[model samples]
Target: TNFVLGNAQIVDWPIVYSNDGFCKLSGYHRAEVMQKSSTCSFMYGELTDKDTIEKVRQTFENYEMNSFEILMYKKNRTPVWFFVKIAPIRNEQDKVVLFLCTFSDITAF
Candidate 1:
């Protein structure tokens, strides 16, 4: 239940769906984030690991399922740790069409 869920379109990767949990986690109303592309670097900050960001890009490029531990800034610009997953969901034709991503707050870790 603690998981924050979001969905994005494959063509341009805009936030097509986001749960209230993610809204709270990112400290942004769903409307603010909706239709904004590049959720990966949206909250980027100086101290956030750039290397990890590359891996996330790779996951998107390869259309593969993967998980990551990342640091992202909230709307208030404070950094927080999150365990995130990105999986490509296939349709009846068995091809990747959407990106289903999950994020869990891991600051207490």
Candidate 2:
């Protein structure tokens, strides 16, 4: 699959272009919101969100979604919730080539 795949890795970073709601909840500027970090940055040690990552990886490998969703991290090292949507973009050869991803933080309160 020659897919242009893109996925958000939430840690201390922003996973996507922030909406007013997400930015307000995450306390990050638009630029700062572009970073990628895991939700459990230090609690379980860096890159310790292995379980979550693996599940997502499985989904991709299985091609189980036109749109996928998951909960990931935030910048403050807090559990900033997320709802992700992934779409496989295909090329002229009808092969997956790019992944269009959009994520939003939903843990405001």
Candidate 3:
């Protein structure tokens, strides 16, 4: 199955566009994730390491394209582990316009 077919989203910062698969994976309704600006740190649950959360935030703030793994949680509070790759989507003149993120579940890996 094409997991990303309906899972991929384009985030232009502050606002996020979520696909159906993303809503299902995060156990969050589209309205909630979008309206709430539910970034990974918020969705990763309170138990997740603070450093991990900060690292992700810094990466975004610095717009550093990199890959990292983290323990995340669904809206239902189920813990999950995923390999995440995030990169900046630039526009003309190479200005960062959006962010592209891909998730790969590696819990059992």
Q: Identify the leading candidate in terms of lDDT.
A: 1
lDDT digits (tens) for residues 25-97 of candidate 1 = 8888888877665445787788889899888888877878899999988899978997888878887888777
Cα lDDT, all candidates: 0.74, 0.45, 0.62
> How much lDDT does candidate 2 score?
0.45
Instruction: Give lDDT tens digits, candidate 3, residues 6-107.
Output: 112334245355667677877877677663432355577667777877777666777667777888888888888877776777768787766666666678
RMSD to the true structure for each prediction, in A, is 2.3, 7.6, 4.5
Number of backbone clashes in candidate 2? 13
Output the number of the TM-score-best candidate. 1
Better of 2 and 3 by lDDT: 3
Better of 2 and 3 by TM-score: 3
Ranking, lDDT, top scorer first? 1, 3, 2
lDDT string, candidate 2, 60-83, tens digits = 554445433344444565664555
